[PDB]
Amino acid sequence: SAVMSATFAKFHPNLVVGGTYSGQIVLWDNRSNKRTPVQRTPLSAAAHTHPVYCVNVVGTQNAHNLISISTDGKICS
């Protein structure tokens, strides 16, 4: 689905992630060569219950957590 401001991750540029339209940050490994979203997270209250706004990384490689502040008023990392 149409994601909302996807971004990268750490240790490699392949397994990227980004807040999709269902409500979670759908991830996909670019090294596996998957056209559509490879694995989408649960879009429940843990992720954005409402729509999505933006996704990014959190901190340096020591604590790089996939943090996404969506269009639900929440930063889910």
Partner: protein
Amino acid sequence: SYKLDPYVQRLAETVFNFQEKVDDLLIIEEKIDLEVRSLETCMYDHKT
């Protein structure tokens, strides 16, 4: 309202993994067909 969000999210995670598995399933069937008929232009292969 028994399992709308629960079974829906379960089917959603397995659904995205299944979309990747759809492209990978086409690639898997292609790998099996290639392993079944890859010697179409070989130059006299015996041990192979």
